[PDB]
Amino acid sequence: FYTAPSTESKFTEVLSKAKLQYPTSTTVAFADDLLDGYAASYFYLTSDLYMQFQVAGSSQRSELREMETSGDEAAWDCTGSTAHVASAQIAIPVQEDGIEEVTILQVHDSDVTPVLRISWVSSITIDGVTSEDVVLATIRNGIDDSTATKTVLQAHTTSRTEFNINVQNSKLSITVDGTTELDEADISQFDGSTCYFKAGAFNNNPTDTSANARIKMYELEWVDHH
């Protein structure tokens, strides 16, 4: 009794270029599975046509991982001259009690390091400034450095919001509803790495391991160019 996101043509291309991971890193549905009507409590189309991801547990995820239509995994040069762009229209609902951070978009390297996470956070303190209920960009400072540079992008709203990630020439930019909120952040620390996009709900440090994080996407696409 779940409608598949594949029933909406606006998702055909991204699903053809994705695989779904749930609840950890193992793939539960490949592109062909997704295109053939895959749907479950953790991944389904709502009545008003959002692709909704839902998951409970610490560091558990319901997440799409960028793929090539060939079936190759996406593995583009993180710092190369070819622009890689991810665009999404995301409605972040008020999260259930005990949900503290939910990652909704990533640039991830082809090993174990997220280059960028865009996440909702209940709270965050950056250089002495605490912000409540915001959308955050987190860029890891290196593969061998567990620390990250964090940037507030937006006050959380339930309204559908346009996010754009543009990666090119060792820099990364983020726009929110068309306004630049992170302007050519350096990611040269991933020279020599390959990268891919992810999108969905990835539940970070919940205080209630039973609560469900929940994220809705009205549009989603990832492209490259030159």
Ligand SMILES: O=C(O)[C@H]1O[C@@H](O[C@H]2[C@H](O)[C@H](O)[C@H](O)O[C@@H]2C(=O)O)[C@@H](O)[C@@H](O)[C@@H]1O
């Ligand atoms: O909480 C920390 O100690 C560090 O977490 C970092 O983000 C994590 C994130 O919580 C997820 O587990 C993800 O899978 O891996 C990320 C990682 O880079 O290890 C950063 O938030 C960092 O600022 C924290 O120091």
